[PDB]
């Protein structure tokens, strides 16, 4: 037993990371088959980033202006195109380590692992959530752009995120692998408002189920509630409204524990109103929202990859 | 910027995991050169585990009684020996994916990544600390025994932990890769007391430095203290006593931030005495002790591996 914030095994993604250099800017790329995917702002200086015209900047670039290095091998660039906010560099070699993969656009509140990289080399792996306001709270220094987020399903890597920007507020913004930003963000160094963020209610409930499975039960109370009553409380505490779809996704955890979803809602309501009184749940002194119902089931049932 | 509990990239270790079966017990092994390393309790049934005589049980086993599977390849066992609490199965093939590696016995309070595995297949990676009482607070289900903990230094994997036991209290015990338990534990299903645990003070101070670097500063106060005065408070709150060795290891973070170590001690003293008043530090509502000073520097300076 026990419950940890576990990332996916990173090896299939490590084999896809490369370094991309254009003029004096270096960041990370993702090499799948004969295409390298990277943030289009690889073509910008710090000064360009204040107000970039990506079309005009890219016209000044030829195939030979992109240096792509896979460990020690230089790749030969034979094509370049811009798709939304990503560059696709066609190269003359297929990556021999390409895994089974898909490109996925995830929903707010879904989780994924980030392989943080610098100069095309991996430094670490961690699990995070796409916030309801389409930011992520990552760990990203200068040079981490082009680092990717992913999920694995047995032998298939679903790439969902490419890192582009740190907002002036210190949270992180990026794209899907088609180059479409999550949320209202642009690849420009300017003031950019993130929405009001909210807590991912269905994830907190999943994590309360994980706690019960692990024996952490002190928070279970004598009350029930309604979906409408609970949602009045969710509004006050800036929690996402719970829907029947969310109730349905929690079904298996309800079944395993014998705790009706609305009973678990009443327990959460009491924690929102009364706080935790200096107590912990699964070693946390706040309500955790970075585990999906699918994450809890995976971890509690020991699902493996290959 | 930002600060996450980051694990090492797991690919070099993924290539070393194999499945070991003896009679009707299956768990994980680690294949390095022509040796597979696994918990000796692979030779026990559930019933044997109550009071095992490992010497007598192992005598009943021959090379052909150990089934070792690397993905789909069966390995041929040509030798077996017991070293403390590990079995070393000599096999007739060197692992082509063996990384540069060492075997290290870590100190209480040091951190490492765990690759959780079932049936020789990786499920996830997470970072944890060896507790001062030589337990770990992991995520380990039935079949996870033989999963390993490690650190990476550029291209070299330092293996420090192999998982053996869940104690009746739900924390986790294991060995170094020479088969010597961390702490007083044995590979027997019996009541086993873990010591009183303590908080890893030098790690909490490292994490307060990480917070300041990231802009989380509200906890900095007007006071200083002495090593002896601080340690009186450390005793009361079950924190490890701080030594000059610990002060010296914090030197670089002191230098970077311009906050003397004893000033940061006085800030910590005030947090121990007054609590956090419903506030957070790096998104935590408790004092975090799973980052070493070396972890903070690594993460804050973007060190990479290969």
Curated annotation (Swiss-Prot), chains A, B:
3CL-PRO exists as monomer and homodimer. Only the homodimer shows catalytic activity. Interacts with host FBXO22; this interaction promotes the proteasomal degradation of nsp5. Residues 1-306 are cytoplasmic. It catalyses: TSAVLQ-|-SGFRK-NH2 and SGVTFQ-|-GKFKK the two peptides corresponding to the two self-cleavage sites of the SARS 3C-like proteinase are the two most reactive peptide substrates. The enzyme exhibits a strong preference for substrates containing Gln at P1 position and Leu at P2 position. This is 3C-like proteinase nsp5. Cleaves the C-terminus of replicase polyprotein at 11 sites. Recognizes substrates containing the core sequence [ILMVF]-Q-|-[SGACN]. Cleaves and inactivates human TRMT1, preventing tRNA guanine(26)-dimethylation of tRNAs. May cleave human NLRP1 in lung epithelial cells, thereby activating the NLRP1 inflammasome pathway. May cleave human GSDMD, triggering alternative GSDME-mediated epithelial cell death upon activation of the NLRP1 inflammasome, which may enhance the release interleukins 1B, 6, 16 and 18. Also able to bind an ADP-ribose-1''-phosphate (ADRP). The lineage of its organism: Viruses, Riboviria, Orthornavirae, Pisuviricota, Pisoniviricetes. It comes from the Viruses. Changing residue 90 to R: In strain: Beta/B.1.351. It is found in: Host cytoplasm; Host Golgi apparatus; Host nucleus. It comes from Severe acute respiratory syndrome coronavirus 2 (2019-nCoV). The active site is at residues 41, 145. Residues 1-306 form the Peptidase C30 domain. There is a cross-link at residues 5, 90 (Glycyl lysine isopeptide (Lys-Gly) (interchain with G-Cter in ubiquitin)). Inhibited by pyridone-containing alpha-ketoamides compounds 13a and 13b. In turn, alpha-ketoamide 13b (tert-butyl (1-((S)-1-(((S)-4-(benzylamino)-3,4-dioxo-1-((S)-2-oxopyrrolidin-3-yl)butan-2-yl)amino)-3-cyclopropyl-1-oxopropan-2-yl)-2-oxo-1,2-dihydropyridin-3-yl)carbamate) inhibits SARS-CoV-2 replication in human lung cells. Inhibited ex vivo by michael acceptor inhibitor N3. Inhibited ex vivo by compound 11a and 11b.
């Amino acid at each position: 037993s026990g419950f940890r914030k576990m990332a996916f095994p990173s090896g299939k993604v490590e084999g896809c990371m490369v370094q991309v250099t254009c003029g004096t800017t270096t960041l990370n790329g993702l090499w799948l088959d004969d295409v390298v995917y990277c943030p289009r702002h690889v073509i910008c200086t710090s000064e360009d980033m204040l107000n970039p015209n990506y079309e005009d900047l890219l016209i000044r670039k030829s195939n030979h202006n992109f240096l792509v290095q896979a460990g020690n091998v230089q790749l030969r660039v034979i094509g370049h195109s811009m798709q939304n906010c990503v560059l696709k560099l066609k190269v003359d070699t297929a990556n021999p380590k390409t895994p089974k993969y898909k490109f996925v656009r995830i929903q707010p509140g879904q989780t994924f692992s980030v392989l943080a990289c610098y100069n095309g080399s991996p430094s670490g792996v961690y699990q995070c959530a796409m916030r309801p306001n389409f930011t992520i709270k990552g760990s990203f220094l200068n040079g981490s752009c082009g680092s990717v987020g992913f999920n694995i399903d047995y032998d298939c890597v679903s790439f969902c995120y490419m890192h582009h920007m740190e907002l002036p507020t210190g949270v992180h913004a990026g794209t899907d692998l088609e180059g479409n930003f999550y949320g209202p963000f642009v690849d420009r160094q300017t003031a950019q408002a993130a929405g009001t963020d909210t807590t991912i209610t269905v994830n907190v409930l999943a994590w309360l189920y994980a706690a019960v499975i692990n024996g952490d039960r002190w928070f279970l109370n004598r009350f029930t509630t309604t979906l409408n009553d609970f949602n009045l409380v969710a509004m006050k505490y800036n929690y996402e409204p719970l829907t029947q779809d969310h109730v349905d996704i929690l079904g298996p955890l309800s079944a395993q524990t014998g705790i009706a979803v609305l009973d678990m809602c009443a327990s959460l309501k009491e924690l929102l109103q009364n706080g935790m009184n200096g107590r912990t749940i699964l070693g946390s002194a706040l309500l955790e929202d970075e585990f999906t119902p699918f994450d809890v089931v995976r971890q509690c049932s020991g699902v493996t990859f290959q």
